[PDB]
């Protein structure tokens, strides 16, 4: 018994896994990796994310919706001067 509560430890941010991280680094061209990188990366990626996400959400309400659109986030990207092609 007492197994209904045995796995409550998700805490999303590790969901970006070390194998992927190195897989990411391997595509980038890094040959060998410190172990503290993985965690430090988690910080860099997240802090990146909301700033757009904030801006990305920042649009949504102004047009009085409740469902985030790619075009919305498309504009979100442009404002910081990193433009993307391919989602209209």
């Amino acid at each position: 018994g007492a197994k209904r509560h045995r796995k409550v430890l998700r805490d999303n941010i590790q969901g970006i896994t070390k194998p992927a991280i190195r897989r990411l680094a391997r595509r980038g061209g890094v040959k060998r990796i410190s172990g503290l990188i993985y965690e430090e990366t988690r910080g860099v990626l997240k802090v990146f994310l909301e700033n757009v996400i904030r801006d990305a959400v920042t649009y949504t309400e102004h047009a009085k919706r409740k469902t985030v659109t790619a075009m919305d986030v498309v504009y979100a990207l442009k404002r910081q001067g990193r433009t993307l092609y391919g989602f209209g």
């Binding site: 433009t83 993307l84 092609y85 391919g86 989602f87 209209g88």
Partner: peptide, 13 residues
Amino acid sequence: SKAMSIMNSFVND
């Protein structure tokens, strides 16, 4: 088609 969309994306920019 996706690349075509890119082209549409690029031209508008």
